[PDB]
Amino acid sequence: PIRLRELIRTIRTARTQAEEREMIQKECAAIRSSFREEDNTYRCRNVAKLLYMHMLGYPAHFGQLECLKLIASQKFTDKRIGYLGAMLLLDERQDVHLLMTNCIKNDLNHSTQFVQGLALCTLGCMGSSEMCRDLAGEVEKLLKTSNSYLRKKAALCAVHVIRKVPELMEMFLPATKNLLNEKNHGVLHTSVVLLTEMCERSPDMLAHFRKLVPQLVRILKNLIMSGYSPEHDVSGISDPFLQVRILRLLRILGRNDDDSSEAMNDILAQVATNTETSKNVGNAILYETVLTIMDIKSESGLRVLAINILGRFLLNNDKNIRYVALTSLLKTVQTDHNAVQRHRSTIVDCLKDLDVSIKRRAMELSFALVNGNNIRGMMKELLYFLDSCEPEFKADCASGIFLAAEKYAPSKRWHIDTIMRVLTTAGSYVRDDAVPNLIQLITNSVEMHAYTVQRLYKAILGDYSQQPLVQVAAWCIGEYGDLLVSGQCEEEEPIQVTEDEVLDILESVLISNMSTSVTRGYALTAIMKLSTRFTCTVNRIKKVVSIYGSSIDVELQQRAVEYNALFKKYDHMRSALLERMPVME
Amino acid sequence: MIHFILLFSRQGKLRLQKWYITLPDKERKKITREIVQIILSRGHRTSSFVDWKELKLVYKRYASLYFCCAIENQDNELLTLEIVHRYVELLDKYFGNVCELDIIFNFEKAYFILDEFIIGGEIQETSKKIAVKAIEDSDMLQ
Amino acid sequence: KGENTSLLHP
Amino acid sequence: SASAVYVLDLKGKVLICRNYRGDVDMSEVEHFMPILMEKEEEGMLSPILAHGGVRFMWIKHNNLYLVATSKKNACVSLVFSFLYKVVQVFSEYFKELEEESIRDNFVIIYELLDELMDFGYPQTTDSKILQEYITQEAPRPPATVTNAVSWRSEGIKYRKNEVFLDVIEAVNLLVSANGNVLRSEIVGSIKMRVFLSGMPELRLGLNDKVLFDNTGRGKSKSVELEDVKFHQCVRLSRFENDRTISFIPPDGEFELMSYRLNTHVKPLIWIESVIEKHSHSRIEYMVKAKSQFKRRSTANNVEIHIPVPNDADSPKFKTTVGSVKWVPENSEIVWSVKSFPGGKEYLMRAHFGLPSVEAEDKEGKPPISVKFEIPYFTTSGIQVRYLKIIEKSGYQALPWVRYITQNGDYQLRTQ
Amino acid sequence: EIFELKAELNSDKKEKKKEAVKKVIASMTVGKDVSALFPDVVNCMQTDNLELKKLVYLYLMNYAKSQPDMAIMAVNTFVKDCEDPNPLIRALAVRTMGCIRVDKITEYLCEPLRKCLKDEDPYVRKTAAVCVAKLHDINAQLVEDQGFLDTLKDLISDSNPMVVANAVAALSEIAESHPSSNLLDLNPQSINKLLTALNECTEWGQIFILDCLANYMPKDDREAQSICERVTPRLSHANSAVVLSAVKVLMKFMEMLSKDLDYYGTLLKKLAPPLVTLLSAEPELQYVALRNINLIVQKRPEILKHEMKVFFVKYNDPIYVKLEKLDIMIRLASQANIAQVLAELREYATEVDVDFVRKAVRAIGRCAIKVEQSAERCVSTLLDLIQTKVNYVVQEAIVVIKDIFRKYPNKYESVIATLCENLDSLDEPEARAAMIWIVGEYAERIDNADELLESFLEGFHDKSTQVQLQLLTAIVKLFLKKPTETQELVQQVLSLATQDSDNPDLRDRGYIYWRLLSTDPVAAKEVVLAEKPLISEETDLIEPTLLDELICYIGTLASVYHKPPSAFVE
Amino acid sequence: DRKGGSYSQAAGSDSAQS
């Protein structure tokens, strides 16, 4: 039985990855040999070594039955090792935790306060959809006990069961009633967390849990007044976790009612000015209070104080403070949108910040703050940011710009120009999913087609490696070939479109190696539709379709065969099915 | 609730791991590798907050070994940092001048302390002395 | 080394 | 056309770098480690990397990967040959290939690197010749490098003239799981340790099938070597004309010729193994080894590697002859036999446990490899005829040669 | 530290000077920017001991671009060292002069280079030949003005075969960067002279000597025959690159040789043993050998026709070698070794490499498509692999079956029943689409085609564009062939892809299908369910112009990547 | 002695081939 320290030293002595793997296998061989003999004396050392090997990146499937055997043991060290193994290498998808239900039930009634607590912690950490069903009765029994060290564990187990089984929340309503007077900070925090979880799970308990709002307000006031305490008082803040839980409960309570919001208005006002934000705990408490005020129907003064606090925090040089302020502003976008326009300069400056999280938050705030009047002004800023954006943020910026144009576009011509510019500059950053949206938007608009067709023709002749831009150009050509070239049945004056460049471009795109089989299909569809839409270049695409009917792609080959058959046998009926598709929202 | 907590060293080695979400072993390893690459590929002025897979990944390492967490977008961000600082202080008080060497050898003690402090991604004891006394009593049981 | 150093140095 | 040959470490630290053309900045080595990590983690790892317009083509040594930067369309084969020559030179100068000598022998290492290659074009690669111009403990360069004979240093005097030969055989058999052998090739290896006085011109003569046919003696046992790879000292023109093996042996051990011909004879060792692996219950290894080699020859240190289960534990071996040990690091049963007389038959009955819980992922079926090495056995039947040792001064040489038969790529495909 | 090092280097004791030089070298090698002390080490430059001189020269070369201004204090030292009686000192000085990346320093080094050009010492001659090429690469105009081309040309016609090879390599490098104007090509006499010194060249000089013939173009068969006869002995060289260079030279010379004469047959016969020997090289060289074989395979496939056993992938073979082995086998795949290829592919399907498994499946499909005599064997192997119950193997087999059906579907009706129930729950887009296409095109031997398509129509609007198009095509084909059991299915598909389908191409296809159905269902049989022409398979053979150009570029980066030399250099 | 086969003396040339 090698000790854990000896095994750790041996592992640290290995330098090469192959040498480390060989040492791990050598240790696992001895571990498996010991396990196969049903060893019970040095089982703790073997279990620790197996856990270390699993955490180091080695398989531990064979060490599954040993953990189950050690869990039902009587030694405290063996029970702890088994619980640790079940928590680490045991999961819902393991399928070996089903037998652990009997062991948990046996240990759930143990007189020792450590074995029962360890079993409850393991059950909470590895709660399964079936273990909680057969363990709900035992969990509720411990929730009504007066054990302060066990009350928090029971609350955590109940919360885990409710999260795993939302339909089991009905059995916890009569158990948590009259439990807001706990003197211990941990018990009160657990009760607050359980109440918040119950409120967030279903709204039926909101009315029942809304009567305790005065009690929660009184508890918060007492905690604020008792600012000195050896326990839970860190950096001058007493019960920061309890204060955060209380603020979250207040924000989640009364968000759509005036009585609940009015009851906690005094507490929010007192905490909004009587809190020290010099430390990180104070800043977090202030952010939680601001979020709760923004999420509840508070007074105008509370909103003004929250706006002032957010403005003060936005100027803080701390990256965490700036990120918290940006998150609060994004959350408070729809609520108090008029007051959010005062930080437009700060939002613009945050885009140039050297923080990836800060830059993302600033971009999200700018996207959410785009209105029907600042869209035209913000378009230039968005284009500049997209031009000088990170490689991983160019696609997100383009998607946000497209969404903003589709939502609050000042005009179709301006929106069309912005979309074309984004497509030409996005390149390989525009998602293929936005192509159907752009096609639908183009089909919906029936007033600007000649200018859009000309722009697409100009932008498609230069480059064709942009799959989304290429697909958009092909769709535009297939939809408006009759408007892209006017009076091009025969030879005419030299214009931008001559009725032959489009066919050559389509053929090059179809035969170009930079085709993913989606743009090629769009080009083939456009060529097929151009037979009836365009009559100047007739009897020329039929040869290409016949030649393209033997393509390697099965779908492409079938499409080419169908096109050739339609061109060679249904020439009169070719125009009978080339009508424009309907336009819908 | 904390989706996962991972204690990874500056060299990339992970000294602690505690995930509250039932995920596949290969998926968990891939997620841990991605988190290490993102954190290891981040500067000192990144705000210690990362939105990876819609998860508030907060990184705050007080030494060569860094710390990570997986917080959902439903709670405050400073609360996670305060909880991490409190856990570090409690571990230091329980151990006494906690360094990297003791973390590898005493990983079981750290896991037991984490279990006794945070269960299921949520907090279990807001105080810093009651948890230490409970851990000492549990250890003294034999 | 850098590992023997305390996590918080308190 | 390498731009800068550098030596890295296992942690990404460049142990030593020596630019030859300077067309590539020295800071590009930083991206080599992340690029290698990405290639290995995505299965795109290759000996030739590419950092934009600069390619990092290098191989991995015992402890470090010798990455040589290049920018133009340089000869990758030339770079690989230069790397192999540098590795051989380092092995000759330093008995070990590790970071312990890189940080301790930099004074001579830098001189060797500077002298070996100039402007990306290597000029001197003979370790024995190079040891007379660069030493770690400087006179004019020896005339051997400037002279045509760059593999035989003049002025060498010895009390005796003894040359030790080593006809090493490599029995490589690629037996499929169906019981048929696909790749069964034997590669000859004539390694000689020439230690004489002066610069003798060896006149090698063996019982080649082509030579016997040309001379008219194509009726006895003649070796039909498909490929013969002569050394640098061997004159290619002499072998091309009338199969005349005329070359100047060097001072020390070197490979003169390397025969390589296909083998159509029965295997020396025939292994009949069975796998009675129960579904998560037990496993049986009915392995029987039949020695098809001649009874007069003994296979010293026979090591038939039998791949046992990776998760198997509590194994029991019921064999007949030879020590059977299971190595957890290798995860296989090592059928170790000290002396295996020709025609011997060893029967083994393995029995090992297996966990009830199935493994998460498959581990594959490693092939069974035999490590038989029977000395004084020439499977190909090629026998040395004569060795014309001619010296200007005139002396009586005492050449010696030994034939060693071992198993090369002699792996047996598992079922 | 720095002050102490400077004080030690500014001392008059050689014992402390050597220690300071070693410490400075270690600091630079240890990763310390010691360029700030370059002027301090400049004073301690002219030393009698050769050990410190080499370190100083190396530091100056490594600290030349960083402080070009501080390097102006070394021209006199280089000039003094360029006349040392010891050839080693002169060679080191010449190498250091050419390694100094100083624009204002190479101008004053023209005289020492001219003096050392005619050096009697072969090492000095090689050093001067290297320095001339380095100066030309650094400054082509200065080299042209110095008139070193004439000296380089006469260098090949002088004694010292190593020096001749070095001069030839320098001339090739200069002409490689040159615009082909005033080429250094030589007549047959120069080629014969080089061949005479080719047998006396070393391992490194052999490559330089053989690279010269790579640019020359023979004009007569007698000259080509002589060149082939002289390069024949090079096939028995221990150096892998020398053998590869000889093979490339022989391949280049074969473009002018006549296949009617027996020389071509002898060359073809003598090249296979060289390839077999090269195939047993190091794993790093295995990829290079495979690339060279693939490049020469598309040109002369009649040489390695019988070389199939040596192409078997080994158990310990590298992944980069295992992948190339499959490509080599596919290129050499033929009906003679069809059974061996199938057996090798069957064994390769039991490995654990997902990429390796996909490569093996692709190789098996390519072999089945290329040779129609083993189509039944390939189909049986694919069916066995599908029955193997492997997700990646199942997807690969589905893709292979879909590819084979479009190629040889005349006798593919015997596998539709087996593939009807083959675990269709796989969500791979490349496998589900292939299965849908096979069902739609082969909706005759399966009586439950409509029932099978019902499960795939649950999420057709959100499955994928290609998957949705394949499902729509299969539904249309089923309606055209059997409209009694698919009358409502066609209407449901049209409603889902025309009303709830926002895909532009998919919406257009749905509208076209609806219009065709509402116009003439009878004509849809001859329009949609028509006999498509023979599918032109994508030929793996490269273009002859690229192959001819790639023939000369043998052993370089452009051959391993199979890309033109101007399409990969920067 | 020596493992792998004892060393044997080698001839000078093919005396039977002249």
Between positions 37 and 56 of E, the ones with CB within 8 A of D are 50-51, 54-55
d(CA D159, CA D65) in angstroms, rounded, equals 43
Contacts of B67 in chain C (CB under 8 A): none
Residue D173, SS3 per DSSP: strand
Q: Could you tell me which of A363, A355, A434, A433 has the C-alpha nearest to residue A393?
A: A363
Closest chain F residue to D378, measured at CA: F5
d(CA D129, CA E61) in angstroms, rounded, equals 27
Number of neighbouring beta carbons within 10 Å of residue D104: 12
Residues 6+ apart with CB under 8 A from E337: E308
Q: Which chains reach chain D with 3 or more Cβ–Cβ distances below 8 angstroms?
A: A, E, F
d(CA D40, CA D32) in angstroms, rounded, equals 12
Question: Do residue A518 and residue E406 have CB atoms under 8 angstroms apart?
Answer: no
Q: Please tell me what resolution, in angstroms, this structure has.
A: 9.3
Contacts of B42 in chain A (CB under 8 A): 356
Q: Does E339 touch chain D (CB under 8 A)?
A: no
CA distance D67 to chain A (A): 19
d(CA A251, CA A287) in angstroms, rounded, equals 12
* CA distances, A324 to each of A33, A331, A341, D364, E59 (Å): 54, 10, 18, 51, 52
d(CA E139, CA E143) in angstroms, rounded, equals 6
| Residue A329 and residue A343 in contact, taking contact as beta carbons nearer than 8 Å | yes
Residues 6+ apart with CB under 8 A from D370: D269, D271, D302, D303, D304, D305, D407, D410, D411, D412
d(CA A57, CA A11) in angstroms, rounded, equals 12
Method: cryo-EM
What's the full length of chain C, in residues?
10
Q: Could you tell me which of D329, D414, E363, D247 has the C-alpha nearest to residue A14?
A: D329
d(CA D118, CA E97) in angstroms, rounded, equals 12
Encode burial over A469-495: b for 16+ CB neighbours within 10 A, e otherwise. bbbbbbbbbbbbbbebbeebeeeeeee
| Residue A416 and residue A381 in contact, taking contact as beta carbons nearer than 8 Å | no
The dihedral over CA atoms of E326, E328, E332, E334, expressed in degrees to the nearest 10, equals 0
d(CA A127, CA A115) in angstroms, rounded, equals 17
Q: Could you tell me which of E303, E305, E381 has the C-alpha nearest to residue E339?
A: E381
Closest chain A residue to E512, measured at CA: A577
Q: Which chains reach chain E with 3 or more Cβ–Cβ distances below 8 angstroms?
A: A, D
Question: Do residue F17 and residue D401 have CB atoms under 8 angstroms apart?
Answer: no
C vs D contact (3+ beta-carbon pairs below 8 A): no
Q: In what order do the strands lie in the sheet with B2-8?
A: B14-19, B2-8, B66-71, B55-58, B49-52
d(CA A213, CA A296) in angstroms, rounded, equals 14
The CA angle D373-D374-D375, to the nearest 5 degrees, is 110
- Backbone φ and ψ for A247, nearest 5 degrees, come out as -65, -40
CA distance B83 to chain A (A): 8
Residues 6+ apart with CB under 8 A from A71: A79, A82, A83, A85, A86, A100, A103, A107
Residues 6+ apart with CB under 8 A from E477: E440, E441, E443, E528, E529
Question: Do residue D260 and residue E280 have CB atoms under 8 angstroms apart?
Answer: yes
CA distance A23 to chain D (A): 7
d(CA A268, CA A247) in angstroms, rounded, equals 9
Number of neighbouring beta carbons within 10 Å of residue D33: 17
| Residue A245 and residue A200 in contact, taking contact as beta carbons nearer than 8 Å | no
Question: Do residue A555 and residue E538 have CB atoms under 8 angstroms apart?
Answer: no
* CA distances, E232 to each of D30, E203, E229 (Å): 44, 16, 5
| Residue A73 and residue D368 in contact, taking contact as beta carbons nearer than 8 Å | no
d(CA A241, CA A236) in angstroms, rounded, equals 13
Q: Would you state the structure tokens that stand for residue B68, as one six-digit string?
A: 């990570």
Nearest CB partner across the interface for C2, out of B64, B88, B92: B64
Q: What is the DSSP letter of E567?
A: G
The dihedral over CA atoms of A47, A50, A54, A56, expressed in degrees to the nearest 10, equals 120
Q: What is the DSSP letter of A441?
A: H
CA distance F18 to chain D (A): 10
What's the full length of chain E, in residues?
570
Residue D400, SS3 per DSSP: strand
Closest chain A residue to D354, measured at CA: A62
